[PDB]
Design a protein around this ligand. Structure first.
Ligand SMILES: NC(=O)C1=CN([C@@H]2O[C@H](COP(=O)(O)OP(=O)(O)OC[C@H]3O[C@@H](n4cnc5c(N)ncnc54)[C@H](O)[C@@H]3O)[C@@H](O)[C@H]2O)C=CC1
Ligand SMILES: CCCCCCc1ccn(Cc2ccccc2Cl)c(=O)c1
Ligand code: NA
Length: 404
């Protein structure tokens, strides 16, 4: 039995943790659930929810909130690697296995579709699941983060870029492997890289989902859809909001209008771009600026009593703005959950510390310790009450998983 089981430890390759611990991921999911149930139910939420990008990060938190906060049946869509003998699956795989297990315990419906959400086939498999099981869905959460997209009509592979626009930028960062504060210069994106990034992370595919669901008659009256976005502090603007990724996020703002239009005539449904705060995610070491920014932001926010991760953010997004009597709206019609990160005093303190951090004062000036812990937590490592010495079977199976 030892031959099919293994001891799983973190292994980090090229800033990527390439292992995930099944028991730890389960404890992580359970902790997020217990948060939602500890805070209490959310009134007037959707009862039948499709989450696109449902296995990790913000879409996972949306699934947990909808299910265990609003009592929803949830259909999740993601792209994850199952575990096998000697070869741990991805954290999102284990997270969803744990979700299905906890949902079934509470008597809630949980079905998932593993495959490319950008494809027509997966959209068709999703429609079929809704038709067979749910009739219609009341809410569609759009929470994909992807480096690439295969266009479903032309077959063209688009690659997203994380580059400024216009001028090259000098970005201070933290290299999490060598633990050094260091700067690098990123060249500006070509028009082609900008359009490719808009193709991947813009709002076309969100549009195609909502249209396909409508064309099939699977969206309830008064339905609702939201796609997640980030605006960030002024310090992130050159690389994010005003870079190639920001061009994609701005495309979301041009898509959301024809979406709200569609659903508002449809029983007064609604659509909103939802703005969330920066958190540690699987990609956080995409660019070394993110670990440094998060390390600083965590420290400053912890001092103010305002630090949160995915579950806290999305719980109050549902409670205050998606289902709540007083939505927190901006001037563009976006829903905002990110205001504690953007508070002037937080930005100012983050900025003052930014020009002071060196290799020697990282632990005195920042919550790098907290960054590292949350990063390991994502993959099911460093969690309380988990025995990391016990053998585990990496081949964890999921009931009602449609493999696309
Ligand atoms: N991470 C952050 O600090 C912030 C993220 N957001 C936005 O939130 C959204 C969610 O991102 P995170 O939670 O960070 O990402 P994540 O990496 O944790 O989750 C991405 C989800 O997309 C799924 N996925 C990726 N490619 C897919 C494909 N081709 N087909 C089906 N599923 C696919 C993954 O399986 C996963 O369930 C993105 O729109 C992101 O820009 C908003 C503000 C801040
Ligand atoms: C300096 C820190 C800037 C970003 C912090 C917030 C954040 C984190 C992750 N993501 C996801 C993401 C980020 C960059 C490129 C592609 C993708 Cl999908 C976001 O969209 C936003
Ligand atoms: Na997500």
């Amino acid at each position: 039995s030892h031959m099919l089981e293994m001891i799983i430890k973190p292994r980090v390759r090229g800033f990527i943790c390439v292992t995930a611990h099944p028991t730890g991921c389960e404890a992580n999911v359970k902790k997020q659930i217990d948060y939602v149930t500890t805070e209490g139910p959310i009134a007037n939420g959707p009862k039948r929810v499709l989450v696109i990008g449902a296995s990790t990060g913000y879409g996972l938190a949306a699934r947990i909130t909808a299910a265990f906060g609003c009592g929803a049946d949830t259909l999740g869509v993601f792209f994850e690697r199952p575990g096998e003998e000697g070869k741990p699956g991805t954290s999102g795989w284990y997270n969803s296995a744990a979700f299905h297990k906890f949902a079934a315990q509470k008597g809630l419906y949980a079905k998932s579709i593993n495959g490319d959400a950008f494809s027509d086939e997966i959209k068709q498999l999703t429609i079929d699941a809704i038709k067979q099981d749910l009739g219609q869905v009341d809410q569609v959460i759009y929470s994909l983060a992807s480096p690439r997209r295969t266009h479903p009509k032309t077959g063209e592979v688009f690659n997203s870029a994380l580059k400024p626009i216009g001028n090259a930028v000098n970005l201070r960062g933290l290299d999490t492997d060598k633990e050094v504060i260091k700067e690098s210069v990123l060249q500006p994106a070509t028009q082609s890289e900008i359009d490719s990034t808009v193709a991947v992370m813009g709002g076309e595919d969100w549009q195609m989902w909502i249209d396909a669901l409508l064309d099939a008659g699977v969206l309830a009256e008064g339905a609702q859809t939201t796609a997640f976005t980030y605006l960030g502090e002024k310090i992130t603007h050159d690389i994010y909001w005003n870079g190639s990724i920001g061009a994609a996020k701005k495309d979301l703002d041009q898509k959301v209008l024809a979406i709200r239009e569609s659903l508002a005539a449809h029983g007064g449904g609604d659509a909103r771009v939802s703005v969330l705060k920066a958190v540690v995610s699987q990609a956080s070491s995409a660019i070394p600026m993110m670990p440094l920014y998060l390390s600083l932001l965590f420290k400053v926010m912890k001092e103010k009593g305002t630090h949160e991760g995915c579950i806290e953010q999305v719980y109050s997004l549902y409670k205050d703005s998606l289902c709540g009597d007083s939505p927190h709206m901006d001037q563009e019609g976006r829903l905002r959950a990110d205001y504690k990160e953007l508070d002037p005093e937080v930005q100012n303190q983050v900025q003052q510390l930014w020009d002071q951090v060196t290799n020697d004062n990282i632990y005195q000036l920042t919550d790098f310790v907290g960054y590292k812990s949350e990063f390991l937590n994502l993959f099911g490592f460093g969690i309380d009450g988990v025995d990391y010495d016990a053998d585990v079977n990496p081949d964890v199976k999921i009931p009602n998983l449609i493999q696309g």
